[PDB]
């Protein structure tokens, strides 16, 4: 409240941690169907379907522009690109099983990064 805070948090290294594990990220082998923006002139029912499309390149355009004020509003967009993944694709599929690994490797090095 007014003139009573916690201890400040030492926030100075957080771009470049974010920047860090997005490469990480990027340079998975199962990066493949989120490096790019979903192409909503050619897949159907994308662009009515997924309210709010997210992928790394533009998460990396946000982040070097920034355009996110701390790292819960990066974690966010990157939640984003999985639960949009599940969303459109089954479990049982090549992409399905792409987002479960790329989710699973991105929490861990979220939490030894940060937690």
Not at 5 to 14: A, C, Q, V, Y
Not at 89 to 110: L, P, T, V
Request: charged share 35%.
């Amino acid at each position: 409240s007014m003139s009573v805070k916690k201890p400040k948090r030492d926030d100075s290294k957080d771009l470049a941690l974010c920047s860090m594990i997005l490469t990480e990220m990027e340079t998975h082998e199962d990066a493949w169907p989120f490096l790019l923006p979903v192409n909503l002139k050619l897949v159907p029912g994308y662009k009515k379907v997924i309210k709010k499309p997210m992928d790394f390149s533009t998460i990396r355009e946000k982040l070097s522009s920034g355009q996110y004020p701390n790292l819960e509003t990066f974690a966010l967009d990157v939640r984003l690109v999985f639960d949009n993944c599940e969303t459109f694709n089954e479990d049982d599929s090549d992409i399905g099983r792409a987002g479960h690994n790329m989710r699973k490797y991105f929490e861990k090095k979220w939490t030894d990064t940060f937690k």
